[PDB]
PDB file of C-alpha atoms and ligand atoms in Angstrom:
ATOM      1  CA  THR A  11     -19.160   6.177 -10.685  1.00 56.57           C
ATOM      2  CA  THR A  12     -21.532   3.380 -11.685  1.00 56.31           C
ATOM      3  CA  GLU A  13     -24.596   2.848  -9.485  1.00 53.25           C
ATOM      4  CA  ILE A  14     -25.155  -0.907  -9.214  1.00 50.42           C
ATOM      5  CA  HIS A  15     -28.553  -2.470  -8.603  1.00 51.20           C
ATOM      6  CA  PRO A  16     -28.703  -4.844  -5.599  1.00 51.27           C
ATOM      7  CA  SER A  17     -30.197  -7.578  -7.808  1.00 48.18           C
ATOM      8  CA  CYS A  18     -26.789  -7.795  -9.523  1.00 50.33           C
ATOM      9  CA  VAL A  19     -24.786  -8.495  -6.325  1.00 51.20           C
ATOM     10  CA  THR A  20     -24.530 -11.743  -4.372  1.00 51.14           C
ATOM     11  CA  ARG A  21     -22.382 -12.149  -1.258  1.00 49.28           C
ATOM     12  CA  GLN A  22     -20.703 -15.534  -0.787  1.00 47.70           C
ATOM     13  CA  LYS A  23     -18.332 -15.213   2.166  1.00 50.52           C
ATOM     14  CA  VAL A  24     -17.135 -12.756   4.794  1.00 47.20           C
ATOM     15  CA  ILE A  25     -13.459 -11.825   4.370  1.00 44.75           C
ATOM     16  CA  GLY A  26     -13.177  -8.815   6.693  1.00 47.68           C
ATOM     17  CA  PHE A  30     -18.433   0.201  10.186  1.00 49.68           C
ATOM     18  CA  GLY A  31     -19.530  -2.794   8.111  1.00 49.35           C
ATOM     19  CA  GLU A  32     -18.043  -5.950   6.628  1.00 46.86           C
ATOM     20  CA  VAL A  33     -16.050  -6.935   3.530  1.00 50.81           C
ATOM     21  CA  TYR A  34     -17.307  -9.923   1.507  1.00 49.88           C
ATOM     22  CA  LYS A  35     -16.290 -11.957  -1.494  1.00 49.53           C
ATOM     23  CA  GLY A  36     -19.148 -12.110  -3.973  1.00 48.97           C
ATOM     24  CA  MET A  37     -20.258 -12.042  -7.584  1.00 51.21           C
ATOM     25  CA  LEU A  38     -21.385  -9.130  -9.751  1.00 51.92           C
ATOM     26  CA  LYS A  39     -23.646  -9.525 -12.787  1.00 52.67           C
ATOM     27  CA  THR A  40     -22.633  -6.898 -15.348  1.00 52.86           C
ATOM     28  CA  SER A  41     -23.036  -6.022 -19.048  1.00 50.52           C
ATOM     29  CA  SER A  42     -26.852  -6.113 -18.773  1.00 48.22           C
ATOM     30  CA  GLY A  43     -26.829  -9.670 -17.426  1.00 48.91           C
ATOM     31  CA  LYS A  44     -24.422 -11.137 -19.948  1.00 52.75           C
ATOM     32  CA  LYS A  45     -21.297 -11.229 -17.779  1.00 54.03           C
ATOM     33  CA  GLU A  46     -20.534 -12.225 -14.202  1.00 53.91           C
ATOM     34  CA  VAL A  47     -17.336 -11.472 -12.285  1.00 55.39           C
ATOM     35  CA  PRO A  48     -15.927 -12.082  -8.788  1.00 57.63           C
ATOM     36  CA  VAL A  49     -15.867  -8.972  -6.588  1.00 56.64           C
ATOM     37  CA  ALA A  50     -15.060  -7.691  -3.142  1.00 57.59           C
ATOM     38  CA  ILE A  51     -17.945  -5.894  -1.410  1.00 56.41           C
ATOM     39  CA  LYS A  52     -17.653  -3.487   1.527  1.00 55.62           C
ATOM     40  CA  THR A  53     -20.812  -2.460   3.405  1.00 53.65           C
ATOM     41  CA  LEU A  54     -21.787   0.507   5.561  1.00 50.82           C
ATOM     42  CA  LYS A  55     -24.336  -0.574   8.178  1.00 48.57           C
ATOM     43  CA  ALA A  56     -27.407   1.353   9.306  1.00 43.78           C
ATOM     44  CA  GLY A  57     -26.846   4.183  11.746  1.00 41.73           C
ATOM     45  CA  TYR A  58     -23.748   5.518  10.002  1.00 40.54           C
ATOM     46  CA  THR A  59     -23.033   9.217  10.510  1.00 39.78           C
ATOM     47  CA  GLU A  60     -22.801  11.906   7.846  1.00 40.18           C
ATOM     48  CA  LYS A  61     -19.017  11.825   8.182  1.00 41.12           C
ATOM     49  CA  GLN A  62     -19.020   8.047   7.780  1.00 38.91           C
ATOM     50  CA  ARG A  63     -21.157   8.342   4.635  1.00 39.13           C
ATOM     51  CA  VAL A  64     -19.041  11.116   3.094  1.00 41.47           C
ATOM     52  CA  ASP A  65     -15.841   9.175   3.846  1.00 38.24           C
ATOM     53  CA  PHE A  66     -17.269   5.854   2.565  1.00 39.69           C
ATOM     54  CA  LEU A  67     -18.611   7.210  -0.731  1.00 39.97           C
ATOM     55  CA  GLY A  68     -15.579   9.500  -0.954  1.00 40.70           C
ATOM     56  CA  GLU A  69     -13.180   6.552  -1.132  1.00 41.27           C
ATOM     57  CA  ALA A  70     -15.223   5.129  -4.031  1.00 41.62           C
ATOM     58  CA  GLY A  71     -15.349   8.506  -5.777  1.00 39.48           C
ATOM     59  CA  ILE A  72     -11.564   8.720  -5.646  1.00 40.40           C
ATOM     60  CA  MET A  73     -11.061   5.093  -6.720  1.00 42.68           C
ATOM     61  CA  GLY A  74     -13.395   5.749  -9.666  1.00 42.18           C
ATOM     62  CA  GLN A  75     -11.005   8.462 -10.924  1.00 43.61           C
ATOM     63  CA  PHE A  76      -8.201   5.972 -11.511  1.00 43.40           C
ATOM     64  CA  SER A  77      -7.587   3.444 -14.252  1.00 43.50           C
ATOM     65  CA  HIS A  78      -4.253   1.703 -13.849  1.00 46.13           C
ATOM     66  CA  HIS A  79      -3.113  -1.905 -13.710  1.00 48.48           C
ATOM     67  CA  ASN A  80      -1.514  -1.386 -10.281  1.00 46.39           C
ATOM     68  CA  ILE A  81      -4.459   0.454  -8.629  1.00 47.39           C
ATOM     69  CA  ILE A  82      -7.512  -1.409  -7.309  1.00 46.97           C
ATOM     70  CA  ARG A  83     -10.381  -1.174  -9.797  1.00 45.59           C
ATOM     71  CA  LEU A  84     -13.809   0.076  -8.725  1.00 48.66           C
ATOM     72  CA  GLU A  85     -16.811  -1.720 -10.197  1.00 49.61           C
ATOM     73  CA  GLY A  86     -19.378   0.624  -8.668  1.00 52.77           C
ATOM     74  CA  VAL A  87     -21.461   1.468  -5.630  1.00 55.75           C
ATOM     75  CA  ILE A  88     -24.873   0.806  -4.151  1.00 55.73           C
ATOM     76  CA  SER A  89     -25.965   4.095  -2.602  1.00 53.90           C
ATOM     77  CA  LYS A  90     -29.721   4.134  -3.295  1.00 51.62           C
ATOM     78  CA  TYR A  91     -30.394   0.956  -1.272  1.00 50.77           C
ATOM     79  CA  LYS A  92     -29.263  -0.157   2.166  1.00 49.96           C
ATOM     80  CA  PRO A  93     -26.835  -1.262   3.310  1.00 49.84           C
ATOM     81  CA  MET A  94     -24.705   0.848   1.030  1.00 49.73           C
ATOM     82  CA  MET A  95     -21.888  -0.994  -0.722  1.00 52.32           C
ATOM     83  CA  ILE A  96     -18.628  -0.359  -2.533  1.00 52.29           C
ATOM     84  CA  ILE A  97     -17.791  -3.074  -5.071  1.00 50.81           C
ATOM     85  CA  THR A  98     -14.235  -3.620  -6.370  1.00 50.40           C
ATOM     86  CA  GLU A  99     -12.276  -6.301  -8.167  1.00 54.11           C
ATOM     87  CA  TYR A 100     -11.454  -9.256  -5.918  1.00 55.40           C
ATOM     88  CA  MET A 101      -7.801  -9.755  -4.987  1.00 58.51           C
ATOM     89  CA  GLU A 102      -7.467 -13.443  -4.143  1.00 62.39           C
ATOM     90  CA  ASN A 103      -4.320 -13.233  -1.998  1.00 63.31           C
ATOM     91  CA  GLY A 104      -5.402 -10.277   0.177  1.00 66.61           C
ATOM     92  CA  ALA A 105      -3.098  -7.791   1.835  1.00 66.49           C
ATOM     93  CA  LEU A 106       0.562  -7.927   0.820  1.00 68.05           C
ATOM     94  CA  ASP A 107       2.066  -7.856   4.337  1.00 69.84           C
ATOM     95  CA  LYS A 108       0.058 -10.903   5.483  1.00 75.72           C
ATOM     96  CA  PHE A 109       0.622 -12.655   2.162  1.00 73.56           C
ATOM     97  CA  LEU A 110       4.387 -12.347   2.476  1.00 73.35           C
ATOM     98  CA  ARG A 111       4.308 -13.419   6.147  1.00 71.98           C
ATOM     99  CA  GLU A 112       2.484 -16.596   5.091  1.00 71.72           C
ATOM    100  CA  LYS A 113       4.907 -17.206   2.206  1.00 70.64           C
ATOM    101  CA  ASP A 114       8.223 -16.522   3.951  1.00 71.30           C
ATOM    102  CA  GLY A 115      11.189 -17.314   1.717  1.00 66.91           C
ATOM    103  CA  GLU A 116       9.111 -18.784  -1.126  1.00 63.52           C
ATOM    104  CA  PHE A 117       9.635 -16.159  -3.822  1.00 60.82           C
ATOM    105  CA  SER A 118      12.637 -15.354  -5.950  1.00 60.47           C
ATOM    106  CA  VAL A 119      14.467 -12.034  -5.806  1.00 61.32           C
ATOM    107  CA  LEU A 120      13.139 -11.277  -9.286  1.00 61.13           C
ATOM    108  CA  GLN A 121       9.582 -11.944  -8.166  1.00 61.87           C
ATOM    109  CA  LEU A 122       9.979  -9.614  -5.168  1.00 58.77           C
ATOM    110  CA  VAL A 123      11.534  -6.888  -7.311  1.00 59.47           C
ATOM    111  CA  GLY A 124       8.688  -7.308  -9.811  1.00 62.62           C
ATOM    112  CA  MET A 125       6.148  -6.762  -7.032  1.00 63.29           C
ATOM    113  CA  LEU A 126       7.941  -3.555  -6.099  1.00 59.86           C
ATOM    114  CA  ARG A 127       7.975  -2.395  -9.723  1.00 59.19           C
ATOM    115  CA  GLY A 128       4.191  -2.821  -9.891  1.00 62.36           C
ATOM    116  CA  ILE A 129       3.651  -0.900  -6.657  1.00 65.73           C
ATOM    117  CA  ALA A 130       6.005   1.840  -7.925  1.00 67.12           C
ATOM    118  CA  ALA A 131       4.071   2.077 -11.212  1.00 67.96           C
ATOM    119  CA  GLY A 132       0.818   2.497  -9.301  1.00 66.70           C
ATOM    120  CA  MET A 133       2.386   5.158  -7.093  1.00 67.80           C
ATOM    121  CA  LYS A 134       3.874   6.991 -10.100  1.00 70.61           C
ATOM    122  CA  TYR A 135       0.376   7.064 -11.560  1.00 71.23           C
ATOM    123  CA  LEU A 136      -1.119   8.437  -8.314  1.00 70.87           C
ATOM    124  CA  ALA A 137       1.583  11.084  -7.929  1.00 72.34           C
ATOM    125  CA  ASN A 138       1.138  12.181 -11.533  1.00 73.47           C
ATOM    126  CA  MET A 139      -2.591  12.613 -10.772  1.00 73.46           C
ATOM    127  CA  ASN A 140      -1.624  14.862  -7.841  1.00 74.59           C
ATOM    128  CA  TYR A 141      -2.850  12.288  -5.311  1.00 72.65           C
ATOM    129  CA  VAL A 142      -0.714  12.023  -2.167  1.00 74.64           C
ATOM    130  CA  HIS A 143      -1.462   8.719  -0.442  1.00 74.70           C
ATOM    131  CA  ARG A 144      -0.116   9.504   3.088  1.00 74.44           C
ATOM    132  CA  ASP A 145      -0.493   5.874   4.326  1.00 70.57           C
ATOM    133  CA  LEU A 146       1.497   3.797   1.888  1.00 67.97           C
ATOM    134  CA  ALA A 147       2.447   0.494   3.535  1.00 72.02           C
ATOM    135  CA  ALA A 148       2.281  -3.147   2.567  1.00 70.92           C
ATOM    136  CA  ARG A 149      -0.945  -3.530   4.606  1.00 72.11           C
ATOM    137  CA  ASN A 150      -2.604  -1.208   2.040  1.00 75.10           C
ATOM    138  CA  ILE A 151      -1.411  -3.150  -1.031  1.00 77.23           C
ATOM    139  CA  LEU A 152      -3.491  -6.089  -2.305  1.00 80.64           C
ATOM    140  CA  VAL A 153      -2.251  -9.111  -4.284  1.00 78.65           C
ATOM    141  CA  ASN A 154      -4.153 -11.096  -6.910  1.00 77.49           C
ATOM    142  CA  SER A 155      -3.805 -14.751  -7.892  1.00 75.81           C
ATOM    143  CA  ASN A 156      -1.168 -13.831 -10.501  1.00 77.42           C
ATOM    144  CA  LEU A 157       0.951 -11.984  -7.897  1.00 77.30           C
ATOM    145  CA  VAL A 158       0.107  -8.537  -9.261  1.00 78.99           C
ATOM    146  CA  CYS A 159       0.256  -5.925  -6.498  1.00 77.75           C
ATOM    147  CA  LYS A 160      -2.215  -3.030  -6.464  1.00 75.10           C
ATOM    148  CA  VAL A 161      -2.375   0.084  -4.279  1.00 77.75           C
ATOM    149  CA  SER A 162      -5.548   0.721  -2.267  1.00 79.43           C
ATOM    150  CA  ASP A 163      -6.743   2.887   0.673  1.00 82.39           C
ATOM    151  CA  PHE A 164      -8.010   6.247  -0.580  1.00 80.57           C
ATOM    152  CA  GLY A 165      -9.932   9.106   1.031  1.00 77.67           C
ATOM    153  CA  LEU A 166     -11.199  12.677   0.616  1.00 80.53           C
ATOM    154  CA  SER A 167      -8.982  13.958   3.448  1.00 79.08           C
ATOM    155  CA  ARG A 168      -6.047  13.530   1.029  1.00 73.93           C
ATOM    156  CA  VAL A 169      -7.431  15.877  -1.659  1.00 75.47           C
ATOM    157  CA  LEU A 170      -9.729  18.403   0.034  1.00 77.28           C
ATOM    158  CA  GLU A 171      -8.005  21.706   0.783  1.00 74.72           C
ATOM    159  CA  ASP A 172      -6.778  22.020   4.391  1.00 72.75           C
ATOM    160  CA  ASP A 173      -8.881  19.046   5.433  1.00 68.92           C
ATOM    161  CA  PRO A 174      -8.905  18.767   9.262  1.00 67.48           C
ATOM    162  CA  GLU A 175      -8.357  14.985   8.944  1.00 67.48           C
ATOM    163  CA  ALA A 176      -5.587  15.150   6.319  1.00 69.67           C
ATOM    164  CA  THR A 177      -2.987  14.009   8.885  1.00 67.33           C
ATOM    165  CA  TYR A 178      -4.984  10.959  10.054  1.00 67.29           C
ATOM    166  CA  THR A 179      -5.620   7.565   8.477  1.00 66.36           C
ATOM    167  CA  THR A 180      -8.665   7.009   6.306  1.00 65.22           C
ATOM    168  CA  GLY A 182      -9.364   8.607  11.710  1.00 68.35           C
ATOM    169  CA  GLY A 183      -6.496   7.113  13.664  1.00 68.67           C
ATOM    170  CA  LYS A 184      -2.870   8.121  13.788  1.00 69.74           C
ATOM    171  CA  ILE A 185      -0.928   7.349  10.620  1.00 69.42           C
ATOM    172  CA  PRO A 186       1.600   4.782  11.944  1.00 69.40           C
ATOM    173  CA  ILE A 187       4.696   6.851  12.098  1.00 68.31           C
ATOM    174  CA  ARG A 188       7.223   4.165  11.154  1.00 70.39           C
ATOM    175  CA  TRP A 189       6.200   4.422   7.479  1.00 71.48           C
ATOM    176  CA  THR A 190       6.137   8.257   7.465  1.00 72.20           C
ATOM    177  CA  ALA A 191       8.807  10.716   6.356  1.00 73.20           C
ATOM    178  CA  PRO A 192      10.293  12.971   9.080  1.00 73.33           C
ATOM    179  CA  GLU A 193       8.886  16.204   7.605  1.00 75.65           C
ATOM    180  CA  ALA A 194       5.390  14.693   7.502  1.00 71.95           C
ATOM    181  CA  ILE A 195       5.681  13.499  11.134  1.00 74.74           C
ATOM    182  CA  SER A 196       7.053  16.795  12.488  1.00 75.75           C
ATOM    183  CA  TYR A 197       5.507  19.451  10.230  1.00 77.16           C
ATOM    184  CA  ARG A 198       2.562  17.622   8.571  1.00 81.91           C
ATOM    185  CA  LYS A 199       4.235  18.236   5.172  1.00 84.45           C
ATOM    186  CA  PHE A 200       2.789  15.278   3.223  1.00 85.24           C
ATOM    187  CA  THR A 201       3.758  15.239  -0.471  1.00 83.15           C
ATOM    188  CA  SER A 202       4.638  12.666  -3.092  1.00 82.80           C
ATOM    189  CA  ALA A 203       8.192  12.856  -1.712  1.00 80.82           C
ATOM    190  CA  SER A 204       6.947  11.690   1.672  1.00 82.57           C
ATOM    191  CA  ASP A 205       5.165   8.867  -0.177  1.00 85.56           C
ATOM    192  CA  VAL A 206       8.593   8.002  -1.649  1.00 87.73           C
ATOM    193  CA  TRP A 207       9.961   7.588   1.898  1.00 88.21           C
ATOM    194  CA  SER A 208       7.014   5.279   2.625  1.00 86.81           C
ATOM    195  CA  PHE A 209       7.735   3.396  -0.588  1.00 83.79           C
ATOM    196  CA  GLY A 210      11.251   2.741   0.685  1.00 84.41           C
ATOM    197  CA  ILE A 211       9.755   1.205   3.836  1.00 84.30           C
ATOM    198  CA  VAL A 212       7.496  -0.931   1.592  1.00 87.53           C
ATOM    199  CA  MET A 213      10.595  -2.125  -0.297  1.00 87.18           C
ATOM    200  CA  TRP A 214      12.041  -3.215   3.034  1.00 85.52           C
ATOM    201  CA  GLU A 215       8.744  -4.942   3.983  1.00 87.90           C
ATOM    202  CA  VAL A 216       8.752  -6.823   0.688  1.00 87.34           C
ATOM    203  CA  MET A 217      12.406  -7.914   0.805  1.00 85.94           C
ATOM    204  CA  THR A 218      12.009  -9.164   4.413  1.00 85.13           C
ATOM    205  CA  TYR A 219       8.730 -11.012   3.749  1.00 83.96           C
ATOM    206  CA  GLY A 220       6.692  -8.713   5.930  1.00 82.18           C
ATOM    207  CA  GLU A 221       8.947  -7.890   8.824  1.00 79.63           C
ATOM    208  CA  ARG A 222       7.814  -5.115  11.100  1.00 79.26           C
ATOM    209  CA  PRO A 223       9.821  -1.942  10.320  1.00 79.32           C
ATOM    210  CA  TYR A 224      12.199  -1.224  13.220  1.00 78.59           C
ATOM    211  CA  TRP A 225      11.177  -4.429  15.103  1.00 79.32           C
ATOM    212  CA  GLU A 226      10.418  -3.755  18.805  1.00 77.08           C
ATOM    213  CA  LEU A 227      11.266  -0.042  18.753  1.00 77.83           C
ATOM    214  CA  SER A 228       8.475   2.181  20.028  1.00 79.71           C
ATOM    215  CA  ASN A 229       7.285   5.106  17.950  1.00 79.92           C
ATOM    216  CA  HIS A 230       9.435   7.541  19.935  1.00 81.79           C
ATOM    217  CA  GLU A 231      12.401   5.191  19.542  1.00 78.95           C
ATOM    218  CA  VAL A 232      11.846   5.127  15.767  1.00 77.58           C
ATOM    219  CA  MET A 233      11.775   8.941  15.706  1.00 77.81           C
ATOM    220  CA  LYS A 234      14.957   8.993  17.790  1.00 74.74           C
ATOM    221  CA  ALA A 235      16.761   6.611  15.441  1.00 73.04           C
ATOM    222  CA  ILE A 236      15.725   8.295  12.181  1.00 70.11           C
ATOM    223  CA  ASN A 237      16.551  11.761  13.421  1.00 72.01           C
ATOM    224  CA  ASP A 238      19.995  10.513  14.480  1.00 69.90           C
ATOM    225  CA  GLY A 239      20.513   9.248  10.915  1.00 72.59           C
ATOM    226  CA  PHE A 240      19.883   5.533  11.601  1.00 72.16           C
ATOM    227  CA  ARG A 241      18.240   3.657   8.735  1.00 69.82           C
ATOM    228  CA  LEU A 242      16.865   0.124   8.525  1.00 71.27           C
ATOM    229  CA  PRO A 243      19.687  -2.336   7.754  1.00 72.65           C
ATOM    230  CA  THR A 244      19.705  -4.483   4.659  1.00 73.64           C
ATOM    231  CA  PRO A 245      17.291  -7.429   4.494  1.00 74.53           C
ATOM    232  CA  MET A 246      18.826 -10.872   4.083  1.00 72.68           C
ATOM    233  CA  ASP A 247      19.587 -11.904   0.498  1.00 73.26           C
ATOM    234  CA  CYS A 248      18.930  -8.402  -0.761  1.00 75.59           C
ATOM    235  CA  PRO A 249      20.541  -7.064  -3.953  1.00 78.53           C
ATOM    236  CA  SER A 250      22.895  -4.166  -3.256  1.00 76.47           C
ATOM    237  CA  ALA A 251      21.122  -2.103  -5.921  1.00 79.70           C
ATOM    238  CA  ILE A 252      17.779  -2.630  -4.178  1.00 79.33           C
ATOM    239  CA  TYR A 253      19.147  -1.627  -0.769  1.00 81.83           C
ATOM    240  CA  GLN A 254      20.822   1.443  -2.285  1.00 80.22           C
ATOM    241  CA  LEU A 255      17.485   2.480  -3.786  1.00 81.25           C
ATOM    242  CA  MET A 256      15.618   2.165  -0.525  1.00 84.28           C
ATOM    243  CA  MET A 257      18.349   4.193   1.227  1.00 83.82           C
ATOM    244  CA  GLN A 258      17.817   6.969  -1.336  1.00 81.67           C
ATOM    245  CA  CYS A 259      14.085   6.959  -0.607  1.00 80.68           C
ATOM    246  CA  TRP A 260      15.074   7.668   3.013  1.00 83.17           C
ATOM    247  CA  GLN A 261      17.139  10.803   2.429  1.00 84.25           C
ATOM    248  CA  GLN A 262      16.447  13.335   5.176  1.00 84.37           C
ATOM    249  CA  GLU A 263      16.193  16.132   2.564  1.00 80.67           C
ATOM    250  CA  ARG A 264      13.073  15.491   0.467  1.00 80.19           C
ATOM    251  CA  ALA A 265      14.450  17.054  -2.617  1.00 80.16           C
ATOM    252  CA  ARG A 266      17.236  14.436  -2.619  1.00 77.21           C
ATOM    253  CA  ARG A 267      14.804  11.522  -2.823  1.00 76.25           C
ATOM    254  CA  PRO A 268      14.050   9.887  -6.177  1.00 72.17           C
ATOM    255  CA  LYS A 269      10.788  10.659  -7.916  1.00 69.06           C
ATOM    256  CA  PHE A 270       8.448   7.765  -8.563  1.00 71.56           C
ATOM    257  CA  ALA A 271       9.430   7.881 -12.243  1.00 72.32           C
ATOM    258  CA  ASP A 272      13.057   7.339 -11.229  1.00 71.94           C
ATOM    259  CA  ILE A 273      12.091   4.381  -9.067  1.00 74.77           C
ATOM    260  CA  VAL A 274      10.116   2.733 -11.864  1.00 72.76           C
ATOM    261  CA  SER A 275      12.947   3.299 -14.343  1.00 75.29           C
ATOM    262  CA  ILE A 276      15.649   1.852 -12.049  1.00 74.59           C
ATOM    263  CA  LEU A 277      13.581  -1.219 -11.147  1.00 76.67           C
ATOM    264  CA  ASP A 278      12.863  -1.842 -14.846  1.00 75.34           C
ATOM    265  CA  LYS A 279      16.567  -1.672 -15.708  1.00 73.79           C
ATOM    266  CA  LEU A 280      17.524  -4.089 -12.931  1.00 73.28           C
ATOM    267  CA  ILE A 281      14.842  -6.623 -13.952  1.00 71.83           C
ATOM    268  CA  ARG A 282      15.938  -6.400 -17.586  1.00 72.74           C
ATOM    269  CA  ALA A 283      19.599  -7.051 -16.755  1.00 71.83           C
ATOM    270  CA  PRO A 284      19.104  -9.537 -13.897  1.00 68.63           C
ATOM    271  CA  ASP A 285      22.831 -10.147 -13.384  1.00 71.16           C
ATOM    272  CA  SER A 286      22.716  -6.667 -11.813  1.00 72.18           C
ATOM    273  CA  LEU A 287      20.726  -8.219  -8.957  1.00 73.45           C
ATOM    274  CA  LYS A 288      23.338 -10.869  -8.113  1.00 76.52           C
ATOM    275  CA  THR A 289      25.551  -8.368  -6.236  1.00 81.87           C
ATOM    276  CA  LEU A 290      24.138  -8.679  -2.704  1.00 78.97           C
ATOM    277  CA  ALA A 291      24.396  -6.200   0.130  1.00 80.53           C
ATOM    278  CA  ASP A 292      26.223  -7.655   3.108  1.00 81.42           C
ATOM    279  CA  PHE A 293      23.738  -8.807   5.733  1.00 81.86           C
ATOM    280  CA  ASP A 294      24.783  -7.558   9.177  1.00 79.17           C
ATOM    281  CA  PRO A 295      24.601 -10.614  11.494  1.00 81.32           C
ATOM    282  CA  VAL A 297      24.328 -12.785  16.307  1.00 78.17           C
ATOM    283  CA  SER A 298      27.638 -14.508  17.095  1.00 81.65           C
ATOM    284  CA  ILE A 299      27.611 -18.239  16.280  1.00 78.29           C
ATOM    285  CA  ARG A 300      31.094 -19.727  16.346  1.00 78.36           C
ATOM    286  CA  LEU A 301      32.013 -23.122  14.911  1.00 74.40           C
ATOM    287  CA  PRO A 302      35.152 -24.733  13.406  1.00 72.92           C
TER     288      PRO A 302
HETATM  289  C1  90K B   1     -14.580  -3.579  -1.568  1.00 73.38           C
HETATM  290  C2  90K B   1     -13.612  -2.524  -1.314  1.00 73.38           C
HETATM  291  C3  90K B   1     -14.056  -1.272  -0.961  1.00 73.38           C
HETATM  292  C4  90K B   1     -13.226  -0.215  -0.714  1.00 73.38           C
HETATM  293  C5  90K B   1     -11.872  -0.429  -0.794  1.00 73.38           C
HETATM  294  C6  90K B   1     -11.377  -1.669  -1.159  1.00 73.38           C
HETATM  295 CL1  90K B   1      -9.708  -1.828  -1.300  1.00 73.38          CL
HETATM  296  C7  90K B   1     -12.251  -2.719  -1.398  1.00 73.38           C
HETATM  297  N1  90K B   1     -11.752  -3.924  -1.760  1.00 73.38           N
HETATM  298  C8  90K B   1     -11.212  -4.763  -0.879  1.00 73.38           C
HETATM  299  O1  90K B   1     -11.138  -4.485   0.276  1.00 73.38           O
HETATM  300  C9  90K B   1     -10.728  -5.958  -1.239  1.00 73.38           C
HETATM  301  C10 90K B   1     -10.479  -6.477  -2.443  1.00 73.38           C
HETATM  302  N2  90K B   1      -9.978  -7.713  -2.465  1.00 73.38           N
HETATM  303  C11 90K B   1      -9.742  -8.267  -1.260  1.00 73.38           C
HETATM  304  N3  90K B   1      -9.240  -9.494  -1.100  1.00 73.38           N
HETATM  305  C12 90K B   1      -9.027 -10.140   0.081  1.00 73.38           C
HETATM  306  C13 90K B   1      -8.986  -9.519   1.305  1.00 73.38           C
HETATM  307  C14 90K B   1      -8.766 -10.256   2.461  1.00 73.38           C
HETATM  308  C15 90K B   1      -8.528 -11.593   2.391  1.00 73.38           C
HETATM  309  C16 90K B   1      -8.529 -12.255   1.204  1.00 73.38           C
HETATM  310  C17 90K B   1      -8.210 -13.628   1.150  1.00 73.38           C
HETATM  311  O2  90K B   1      -9.059 -14.426   0.880  1.00 73.38           O
HETATM  312  N4  90K B   1      -6.897 -13.876   1.342  1.00 73.38           N
HETATM  313  C18 90K B   1      -6.421 -15.074   1.187  1.00 73.38           C
HETATM  314  C19 90K B   1      -7.151 -16.236   1.329  1.00 73.38           C
HETATM  315  C20 90K B   1      -6.526 -17.438   1.069  1.00 73.38           C
HETATM  316  C21 90K B   1      -5.198 -17.514   0.674  1.00 73.38           C
HETATM  317  C22 90K B   1      -4.462 -16.353   0.533  1.00 73.38           C
HETATM  318  N5  90K B   1      -3.186 -16.375   0.148  1.00 73.38           N
HETATM  319  C23 90K B   1      -5.110 -15.153   0.818  1.00 73.38           C
HETATM  320  C24 90K B   1      -8.777 -11.492   0.067  1.00 73.38           C
HETATM  321  S1  90K B   1     -10.252  -7.151  -0.080  1.00 73.38           S
END
């Protein structure tokens, strides 16, 4: 983890306790300058807040993959402390899709999912269980590359008392596998369930999983065997894959390597994506 000197960081604009800014980072001993995102931790933070803040950077610094947000470094010796990452111009994937409804091709959407799956395969192979995979935690750059974010020590430390929470609130249950909800059994296979929900988010341009259903209503539906219906204009192969991510039995779910492989094969033979799942309709009746 690279300690960055504050003289190398300028903040240009607020984009999101503390704040998140867009800024510039001078690197390579003053010879290079790159756009960055900058998250601060304001004075008065608690020990827990510090350990969680620097812990997310420490975890991010362990990864090096095209589909995982890249850490530039941290400012810990000066205040306010900062975490500095690459800047993703299009922000969170759920909002991005909700502002771009219907504008992408099926192949583009499937390619986004392949990138997310590659990042998740990498995480799982590192023995990192994400526990909060959702489109809100995926960022998108100007070239439409999707990268996983949102990391924390409660996911790796042994029997961490906060392992079942978000990086401190309740993990929104509608992305979470039944065995993680009911028994706190979070594993890469529960991340696969979440990935299936992300596939549905992507193919619907950011629809809310399960619409108006309350959390208890979602639990009722899933435990009765209900599953989210196909998105509109969705390839049958893509819907079949998300259904397999949602198998009740975790051992029946695909591994991330399987997901990456299948998505690759579909993209490479794109006629395979022209078979669409039937969209289950409202009754509008005309001649
Ligand atoms: C700095 C940091 C510390 C710890 C964890 C993480 Cl993941 C990060 N990094 C970031 O939070 C971010 C990296 N890149 C970000 N980009 C971002 C976030 C929110 C909004 C925007 C933005 O400007 N979105 C936008 C603006 C205009 C048009 C479109 N399509 C999208 C861009 S936020």
